[PDB]
Structure formats: structure tokens, C-alpha cells
């Protein structure tokens, strides 16, 4: 039980079959869809449907979290008032792999201009560090101002959050105090 | 139990992979695929499979109805026929979200040329009207031949649907009785 | 019993939402997961996730074999370590159809160049063969240095494979023995 958590799971996939007769009905809908907490992520999955027309699968990716049903319902209902469908089925997750993560802040110095890269550090219970992820876009952005490559910030920023410092670019190196 | 329904569900996901080595296989096996009743939609879902190799993870949507097992049953043999797969994979979904509804022919003159438009109309027990959906592309279809826009043809069919009335879009009117 | 097998499958889904945040990690993570024998296919769906922002569904398709959960821990792990993510969810087929099969080797010969194609042959117990399948890439391959057309190829090296003859396709011959 020290490593992997395996545990069940309040991820659910909300399905429904639209015909594409309405035509700005689903970018609408996802748009309207997203702005809640619960939903992760929407895509309408193109298909061929049953007189050869062509439909979309609405697939709507969906945390119950604490509870799942008035969640589920929730976004069963938007579904149907934003598309006009009357049938949106449910398909749970037998189970989630996790592992616990935190956030780390690490302050980056090139002699006269900074910035802050979130560091993901993912560690199980026995001290595996299956991840250290500095926060890649950061870390891009960071490397064309500098100039310096885009990886070997992410490498420097990583090695920082491991042990606590901040990392000179200038000079190449982690201080730690 | 008098808002959404939920109940249990017969849709079903019957999935195989395909090796893209058999090329116009896809297409003509989802042409025989939807041609039944039960077949809800049908997607290849390109996909990298084992040796660097492409493929596609051919995705039946299937309602089961009465009988589910019946249903998986044909529609997995069509597949193993149809596309050379010995191995279909069955995922049912946990429930279905649904709303009771019904349609409702309205009749729209303008003037000199009319139509019919279906309106799916979903209501609960409880008297909620969760949509009233005119179908869009009718909707559409009749706002170029009258010029007039296609969502206040919507709009003034889904109020005459509500009063069972009939859309005289030359006097802007909707007539009851 | 003796059609079509319908028994409890061991292929499952393995589900993850990235940010399209770090870059060339999706197609690299799907390059070291398929090196995996259990692991069938891999795809990213493009999503439309919380902020509007866009991300990939990266959906792992895994045949967990004799014993499941090893593989799908593996695989899951492999998921994070790749991606970065601390959260896989795992969705498990409800049953697999399945028609015993096996493969047969033709001989081709035309006069002076000759090949050898597999044959896919899947029969049920009460001796209904639901598909003979020559391999089409095979079949077209040798269509084009042939130059006669690759389903007639196939009818023929389908014949041959019911009989366990071999094609001689100058003299437009199966050859028993």
C-alpha cells in the first residue's frame, strides 16, 4: 500500500449521441460545460450514425469528488438543457491509480530579471520520487528570455525543488542557504 | 424520482483494434454496422499501436434495449465477419440520465408557402420543461426561403409548441384557436 | 456455449487528462508505452478542458492477460513517471467475444516468383468458419508485382487455406496435393 494508491474511483464518463442538425450547439454547450468545477474535460467524438449522418459523441469527463451523484446529475441536466438530448448515459471508472503530489515555487535569477516556476513533486510513502516536473510552459517562456534551452531550466529548476533552493542561471547555480 | 430519471442502462461500447493493413475495411464494415436498429454510431479511433504501428480502435455504440445480450451478441459477430477481429471487447454503461418527451408537429405558414417543424418537447413529472428543442435544420431551412432569421423561427415555433398553436410568420403571429 | 465465447475480459482503459503544457511528451511517453507487450493501442484525444483550455485525454488500451492488476499498475506507473500526471484512471471491459482462431501459411507461386501469406482462420466449435482471412497487405503486395488484381488474390489464397493447398496463380490453380 506504499507505493501506487489504488482506490476507487469518482471519475465518470457522461455520453450522448447528438445529430449534427444543430449546428453551434456544441461548442456552445462545452463552453457552458467547462466553466464548472467537476467537469475535466469535454470533446465531441465525430461518428457515423444510423441513416449514414454523421453525429457527434458528447463526452464529458467528469470528477464526482466527494459526491458523485448530485455532481453526475448536475451536468447529466446542463447536458440536456444545453443540447436538447433526453439520454445521457454514465460509465465509472473501476478504479484510480494516484500517487501524492505537492507544489514547490522555485525562485529563478538570471543576475537582473526573475520568475517563479511551479514544480510538481509527486513522492510516494516509501520515498520514491516517481516525478519532479517543473512546469514546462514556464520553463519555455523562462528559456527564450534567457536564451539559454527550454530543459536545461526544467533539469536546474528540478535539482532546486529537490533540495529546497533557488536556482542562478547566470552563474549556474542552486543555492540552497 | 420525479425530476431526472436515472436508471440502469443498455447502451454498450463494443470495441476491437484493427491493424490498418486491411484498408477499406472500416468504412464499409460501419455501412453494414449502423444499417440495424440498435447501432447508435460507429468511430474508428486512430491509434498507435505495437510496433510503431497504426491502427484503429473501431468504437460501436450499442443500445441493447430489451434484450442487451442478444444485441452485443449480432453486433459482435457483424463486427468478427465484417472486419476479420476474433476478439470484441463489451463496456455497458453504470446508468442512463433521461427526461420523458414527445414531439409535437407545428404547423408554420408564411402567408403563401408553409412547412411542419418537429419539436421535441422533454418534461418531467414534477411539470419542468427542461427543453423545448424545434429540430434546427427545418428551422434553418425555413428561415432562407423566408429570408427571415432561423432562430426566431425557433423561437416563435417553440412558443407555439408550448400553446399548440401554429406560427404565422407573415403577421408574426402565433394562433391557438 | 459453442458459438460465439462471451467471457470476462482482461483488457481495460487506462485514462489521464494532460495540459497541452509540456509539449513533445505526449507523442514520446506513447512511444515507450507501446514497447510493452500489454499494452494494445494508445491515443491522445484532443479535449477542451477547464479554463478553455485545450488538453488530451491520453487513453492507453491494455490487455491485462493472466494477471491484471501487475500490468495495469505497471502501465499506470509508466503513465505517471512519462507524463507527469498523479492520477490514472482505469476502466475495465464487462466481458470479451471471442471465436477461436489460428493461422495458416499459404505457398503462392506465379510460375517463377512465389510468397507466403497468413491466413487468419476462425471457427466456432459447431464448425462454422465466420472468417478466413488472408492478409490484405500481403495480398495487395503481391497484387501489384503480379499485376492481377489483390482480392482475387485473396479469393484464391482463401480457397487454398480451406483446402490447405497452395496457389498457382499463372494456371489460375489450387493444388491439394
Known amino acids: 500500500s506504499l507505493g501506487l494508491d489504488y482506490e476507487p474511483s469518482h471519475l465518470m464518463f457522461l455520453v450522448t449521441v447528438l445529430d449534427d442538425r444543430d449546428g453551434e450547439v456544441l461548442g456552445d454547450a462545452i463552453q457552458k460545460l467547462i466553466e464548472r468545477e467537476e467537469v475535466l474535460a469535454c470533446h465531441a467524438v465525430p461518428c457515423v450514425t444510423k441513416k449514414n449522418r454523421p453525429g457527434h459523441v458528447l463526452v464529458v ?9 448530485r455532481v453526475a446529475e448536475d451536468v447529466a441536466r446542463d447536458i440536456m438543457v444545453l443540447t436538447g438530448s433526453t439520454g445521457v448515459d454514465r460509465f465509472d471508472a473501476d478504479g484510480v491509480y ?9 525562485r529563478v535569477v538570471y543576475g537582473e530579471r ?3 516556476v511551479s514544480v510538481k513533486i509527486a513522492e510516494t510513502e516509501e520515498g520514491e520520487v516517481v516525478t519532479v516536473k517543473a512546469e514546462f510552459d514556464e520553463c519555455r517562456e523562462i528559456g527564450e528570455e534567457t536564451g ?4 536545461e531550466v526544467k533539469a536546474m529548476v528540478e535539482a532546486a525543488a529537490r533540495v529546497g533552493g533557488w ?3 547566470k552563474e549556474r547555480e542552486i543555492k540552497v542557504q
Chains 1, 2, 3 share one sequence.
Open 61 to 69: 469527463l467528469v470528477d464526482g469528488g466527494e459526491d458523485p451523484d
Open 98 to 106: 494516484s500517487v501524492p503530489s505537492r507544489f514547490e515555487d522555485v
Open 114 to 116: 526573475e520568475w517563479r
Open 148 to 151: 539559454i534551452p527550454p530543459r
Open 167 to 169: 536556482v542562478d542561471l
